[PDB]
Amino acid sequence: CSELIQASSRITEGVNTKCRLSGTALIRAGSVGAEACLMLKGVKEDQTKFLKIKTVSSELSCREGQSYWTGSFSPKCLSSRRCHLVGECHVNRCLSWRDNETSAEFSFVGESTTMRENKCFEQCGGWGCGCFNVNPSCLFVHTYLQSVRKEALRVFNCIDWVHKLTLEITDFDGSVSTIDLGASSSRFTNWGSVSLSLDAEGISGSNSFSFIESPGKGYAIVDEPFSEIPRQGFLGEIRCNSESSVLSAHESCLRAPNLISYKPMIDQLECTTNLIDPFVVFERGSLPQTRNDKTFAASKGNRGVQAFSKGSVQADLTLMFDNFEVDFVGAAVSCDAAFLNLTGCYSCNAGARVCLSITSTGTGSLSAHNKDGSLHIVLPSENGTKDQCQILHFTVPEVEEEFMYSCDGDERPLLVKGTLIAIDPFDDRREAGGESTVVNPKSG
Amino acid sequence: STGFKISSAVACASGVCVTGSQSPSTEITLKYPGISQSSGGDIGVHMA
Amino acid sequence: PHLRNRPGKGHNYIDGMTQEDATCKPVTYAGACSSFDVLLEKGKFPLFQSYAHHRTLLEAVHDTIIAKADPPSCDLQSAHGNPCMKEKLVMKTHCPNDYQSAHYLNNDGKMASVKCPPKYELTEDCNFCRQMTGASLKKGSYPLQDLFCQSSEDDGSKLKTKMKGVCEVGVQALKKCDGQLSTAHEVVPFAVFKNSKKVYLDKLDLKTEENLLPDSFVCFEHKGQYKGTMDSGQTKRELKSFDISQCPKIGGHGSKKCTGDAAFCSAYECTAQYANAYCSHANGSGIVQIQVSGVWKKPLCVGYERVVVKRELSAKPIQRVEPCTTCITKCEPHGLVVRSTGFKISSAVACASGVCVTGSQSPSTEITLKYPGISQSSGGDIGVHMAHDDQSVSSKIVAHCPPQDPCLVHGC
Numbered sequence: 077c078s079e080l081i082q083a084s085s086r087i088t089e090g091v092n093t094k095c096r097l098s099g100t101a102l103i104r105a106g107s108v109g110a111e112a113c114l115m116l117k118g119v120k121e122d123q124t125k126f127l128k129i130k131t132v133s134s135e136l137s138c139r140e141g142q143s144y145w146t147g148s149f150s151p152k153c154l155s156s157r158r159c160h161l162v163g164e165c166h167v168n169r170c171l172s173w174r175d176n177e178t179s180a181e182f183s184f185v186g187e188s189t190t191m192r193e194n195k196c197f198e199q200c201g202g203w204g205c206g207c208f209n210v211n212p213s214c215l216f217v218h219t220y221l222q223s224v225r226k227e228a229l230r231v232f233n234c235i236d237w238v239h240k241l242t243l244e245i246t247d248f249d250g251s252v253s254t255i256d257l258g259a260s261s262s263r264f265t266n267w268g269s270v271s272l273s274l275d276a277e278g279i280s281g282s283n284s285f286s287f288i289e290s291p292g293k294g295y296a297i298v299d300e301p302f303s304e305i306p307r308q309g310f311l312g313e314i315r316c317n318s319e320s321s322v323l324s325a326h327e328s329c330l331r332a333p334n335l336i337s338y339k340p341m342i343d344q345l346e347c348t349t350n351l352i353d354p355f356v357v358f359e360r361g362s363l364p365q366t367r368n369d370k371t372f373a374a375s376k377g378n379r380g381v382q383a384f385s386k387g388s389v390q391a392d393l394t395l396m397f398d399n400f401e402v403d404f405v406g407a408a409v410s411c412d413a414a415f416l417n418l419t420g421c422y423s424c425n426a427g428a429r430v431c432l433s434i435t436s437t438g439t440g441s442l443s444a445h446n447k448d449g450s451l452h453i454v455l456p457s458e459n460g461t462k463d464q465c466q467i468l469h470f471t472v473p474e475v476e477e478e479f480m481y482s483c484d485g486d487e488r489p490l491l492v493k494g495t496l497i498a499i500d501p502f503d504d505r506r507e508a509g510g511e512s513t514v515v516n517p518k519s520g
Numbered sequence: 521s522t523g524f525k526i527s528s529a530v531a532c533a534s535g536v537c538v539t540g541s542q543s544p545s546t547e548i549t550l551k552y553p554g555i556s557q558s559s560g561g562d563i564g565v566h567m568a
Numbered sequence: 569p570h571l572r573n574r575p576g577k578g579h580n581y582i583d584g585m586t587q588e589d590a591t592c593k594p595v596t597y598a599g600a601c602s603s604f605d606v607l608l609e610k611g612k613f614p615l616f617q618s619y620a621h622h623r624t625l626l627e628a629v630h631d632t633i634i635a636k637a638d639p640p641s642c643d644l645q646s647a648h649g650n651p652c653m654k655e656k657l658v659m660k661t662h663c664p665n666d667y668q669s670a671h672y673l674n675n676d677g678k679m680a681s682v683k684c685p686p687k688y689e690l691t692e693d694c695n696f697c698r699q700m701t702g703a704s705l706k707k708g709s710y711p712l713q714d715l716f717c718q719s720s721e722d723d724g725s726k727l728k729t730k731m732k733g734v735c736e737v738g739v740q741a742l743k744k745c746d747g748q749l750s751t752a753h754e755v756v757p758f759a760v761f762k763n764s765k766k767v768y769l770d771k772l773d774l775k776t777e778e779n780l781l782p783d784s785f786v787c788f789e790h791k792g793q794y795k796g797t798m799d800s801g802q803t804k805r806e807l808k809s810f811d812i813s814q815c816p817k818i819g820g821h822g823s824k825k826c827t828g829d830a831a832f833c834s835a836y837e838c839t840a841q842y843a844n845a846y847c848s849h850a851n852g853s854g855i856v857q858i859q860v861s862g863v864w865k866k867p868l869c870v871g872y873e874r875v876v877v878k879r880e881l882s883a884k885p886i887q888r889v890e891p892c893t894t895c896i897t898k899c900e901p902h903g904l905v906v907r908s909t910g911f912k913i914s915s916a917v918a919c920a921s922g923v924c925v926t927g928s929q930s931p932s933t934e935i936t937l938k939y940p941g942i943s944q945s946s947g948g949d950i951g952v953h954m955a956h957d958d959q960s961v962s963s964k965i966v967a968h969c970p971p972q973d974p975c976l977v978h979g980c
């Protein structure tokens with residue numbers, strides 16, 4: 077499918093004399109679920125090492141910007157009522173009480189890291205009230221917030237979305253390699269590095285929603301702009317910088333003015349507040365939600381969020397210094413192959429699925445090539461009988477071809493039959509295409 | 521879906537996925553993802 | 569001064585230099601030990617000052633955690649003509665004045681030391697001995713390296729130094745290299761495990777986990793305290809060390825009543841009577857584990873050194889040679905056509921005696937361009953500069969053509 081003649085080396089009998097193949101390869105990445113093929117040709121009926129690049133999936137990952145944490149909080153109040161001229165019950169001190177200054181009555185609290193505030197309220201003054209003096213008495217209140225539930229939620233926003241391609245690197249003699257990479261980025265794998273161009277689109281705009289993450293539980297979407305300043309009656313009215321601060325109600329957490337409602341009725345004070353439960357909002361908007369045809373959802377492995385939108389990209393990945401050769405592969409192996417069936421469509425991004433029954437005596441590959449060399453089929457061969465499958469592209473309603481198949485041995489013919497279904501576009505001018513297309517919603 | 525209603529859902533089959541949105545209901549129908557309808561196989565479904 | 573409540577025996581002295589046994593045998597809050605007080609100076613030995621409640625090198629030696637090397641300290645007075653001063657000469661140290669000895673952890677993982685002849689002192693680089701008249705040498709030995717040790721049973725016989733791009737670090741010859749060798753002095757962290765040698769590390773990823781073993785508790789007592797050791801009138805308020813082996817374990821037997829904080833009461837049995845000592849939990853102690861090769865292990869000692877490392881900058885920065893000629897250039901009456909075998913051509917330009925002509929097209933194996941000036945009529949040599957999709961292909965080629973006939977070009 078693609079040779080390395082300008083950098084090919086002698087890959088002596090039996091032993092390997094690879095010379096660290098340095099020539100880079102420029103081949104177009106296959107569509108989603110397709111594969112990219114390489115040719116390492118040595119001596120006929122020998123060598124024929126195949127490097128494959130499976131295209132697992134293409135996702136529109138999120139690039140998070142600012143973030144914070146929040147939880148559920150409830151207040152507790154301590155009250156102390158003193159008559160006039162007792163302690164700091166002077167009226168001038170009474171109205172001018174700073175919220176961050178603690179009264180002397182609540183000194184057993186002492187120094188604490190909890191979020192807290194202090195208020196002073198004037199009351200009646202007179203023998204009916206309980207004090208001989210007729211000037212107004214004072215009531216000192218110290219309130220501190222405490223976390224109700226032992227959980228926290230992280231609220232963030234996606235400034236932009238980035239295309240992200242997942243590849244499965246079927247390396248020479250072993251396919252234990254899976255990598256993930258973005259636009260104009262390279263990953264230092266074995267035998268050198270693999271780079272991705274993806275020159276079509278490196279971004280897919282922005283958004284004006286917010287996202288919630290519950291660790292170990294999933295994600296969710298809330299339909300409000302991400303606000304960096306706390307606001308009463310909204311999400312993130314009390315926000316922190318870490319899960320520990322939320323779970324401990326640390327004083328470093330920020331909050332809006334006037335969240336606590338005070339009821340200084342004459343019998344006992346009532347300290348209470350109405351707070352948006354972040355867990356309720358999190359459960360309301362679990363991730364599989366579609367907004368103006370975007371359908372955000374959890375990325376595979378639940379490490380983030382996606383964005384399924386109509387579109388496509390062009391990906392041209394490049395290898396470099398690809399050198400992975402051994403000596404034991406000098407021995408030859410024979411197989412037996414049997415055509416199984418053919419399904420799928422033509423001229424479609426999904427492509428056509430072929431399947432082949434390989435009856436082989438050992439480890440090996442398959443190198444079926446058509447008469448004109450346009451279409452290539454590669455499938456591993458294993459001991460006994462196995463059923464493998466591959467993805468190809470066609471442009472004919474009916475498929476009837478012959479391929480020259482041989483696993484490092486004698487050349488044999490393989491004949492493929494079957495037809496292909498026609499995809500209804502409901503609107504066609506010239507053709508569909510075969511580029512790399514991202515997942516799209518139905519309403520798009 | 522017996523009991524719980526489904527509003528929006530997505531179905532993935534070998535990379536390609538297809539979404540669907542509807543009012544909360546005990547059942548939901550979606551377009552087939554790619555050639556999974558022709559090729560059968562196993563299709564994953566994620567719904568809310 | 570809680571840091572002077574040493575774990576274990578706390579014997580901060582070296583063999584031979586036993587003239588300070590009053591205060592260097594078990595180090596307590598009272599006295600002053602020359603081989604220990606240097607560790608607590610601000611700005612010096614920060615790694616140990618962080619892990620202040622772990623054993624030192626001498627403490628580890630006296631607890632049989634770390635062995636003593638062959639010729640434990642070959643005296644320069646009697647063995648200055650022997651190949652002793654070899655691992656020390658590759659380190660860059662700095663000793664203060666009036667010190668007659670200095671100990672370090674050698675390559676094998678044992679403790680060695682350098683001792684000057686009597687009345688001599690180690691110079692500022694600890695490499696030479698010099699004599700000063702009327703000078704009072706300190707009775708201890710200067711710790712050369714910044715390290716802390718602990719007791720471990722984890723095996724490390726398969727552990728070895730794995731440093732990338734390093735031909736030789738310290739006294740260890742990692743490999744054999746030829747060519748350029750960037751030689752310098754660098755600060756390399758190192759660890760020592762059980763049944764192994766020194767292991768230099770590229771990165772220091774270590775974590776500590778707490779426990780309730782006796783080494784994790786600091787037990788003290790007051791001087792002049794009622795019904796305790798040293799029960800006599802005192803003129804000063806000073807503390808005294810206590811041995812935790814006396815306080816009974818929970819659901820067990822013991823010889824002394826013993827009280828403490830929450831952790832001690834959870835681990836040991838706190839008394840309900842008048843207590844004989846107070847046992848707090850260690851500020852920082854525990855078990856330290858080092859990440860080597862991506863897996864955590866329990867090291868005997870952890871420290872860092874300033875040793876001479878030889879690196880290889882590069883074998884070859886980059887090789888750019890591309891005499892590629894895998895294309896055919898032929899001048900045609902319709903236009904100047906070049907067919908590039910393999911690599912596709914998107915845009916190209918042609919030069920012919922100053923005048924140039926450009927062309928743009930989709931990436932393809934061939935491209936056609938208008939002739940530059942009168943080169944079509946005059947023939948000659950025309951240069952071509954094209955942009956290929958691949959690499960390692962020459963972008964400058966030359967095409968020789970004879971004079972052409974425009975009659976076929978404009979024929980209609």
Ligand SMILES: *[C@@H]1O[C@H](CO)[C@@H](O[C@@H]2O[C@H](CO)[C@@H](O[C@@H]3O[C@H](CO)[C@@H](O)[C@H](O)[C@H]3NC(C)=O)[C@H](O)[C@H]2NC(C)=O)[C@H](O)[C@H]1NC(C)=O
Nearest residue numbers: 416417418419430431432462463464465558559560561562
């Ligand atoms: C065209 O041939 C294909 C190749 O045989 C068929 O596609 C796949 O064949 C596999 C076996 O050859 C099946 O594997 C089985 O899958 C089920 C679950 O799907 C597992 O429980 C089985 O263990 C597994 N193996 C066996 C031996 O059963 C695949 O299921 C199958 N893919 C499908 C059915 O989508 C095609 O079925 C076939 N098509 C036609 C029209 O003939």
Ligand SMILES: *[C@@H]1O[C@H](CO)[C@@H](O[C@@H]2O[C@H](CO)[C@@H](O[C@@H]3O[C@H](CO)[C@@H](O)[C@H](O)[C@H]3NC(C)=O)[C@H](O)[C@H]2NC(C)=O)[C@H](O)[C@H]1NC(C)=O
Nearest residue numbers: 942943944945946947948949950967968969970971972973
């Ligand atoms: C009109 O007369 C001109 C003058 O002779 C010709 O133009 C040039 O003539 C040179 C020799 O007189 C040629 O030089 C040769 O060039 C080639 C490569 O181009 C070299 O390898 C040779 O060493 C060099 N010398 C000799 C003796 O061959 C030029 O090539 C030539 N220019 C061209 C051909 O473009 C014209 O050719 C001529 N025209 C007509 C229509 O008669």
Ligand SMILES: *[C@@H]1O[C@H](CO)[C@@H](O)[C@H](O)[C@H]1NC(C)=O
Nearest residue numbers: 158160161162163164165166
């Ligand atoms: C009365 O006593 C209070 C303390 O209860 C004290 O703060 C206040 O200053 C006193 N007033 C006087 C002495 O006038």
Ligand SMILES: *[C@@H]1O[C@H](CO)[C@@H](O)[C@H](O)[C@H]1NC(C)=O
Nearest residue numbers: 172173174175176177178179
């Ligand atoms: C917080 O309290 C301190 C001391 O009580 C005071 O100095 C400071 O001004 C207060 N901060 C305010 C009022 O913002």
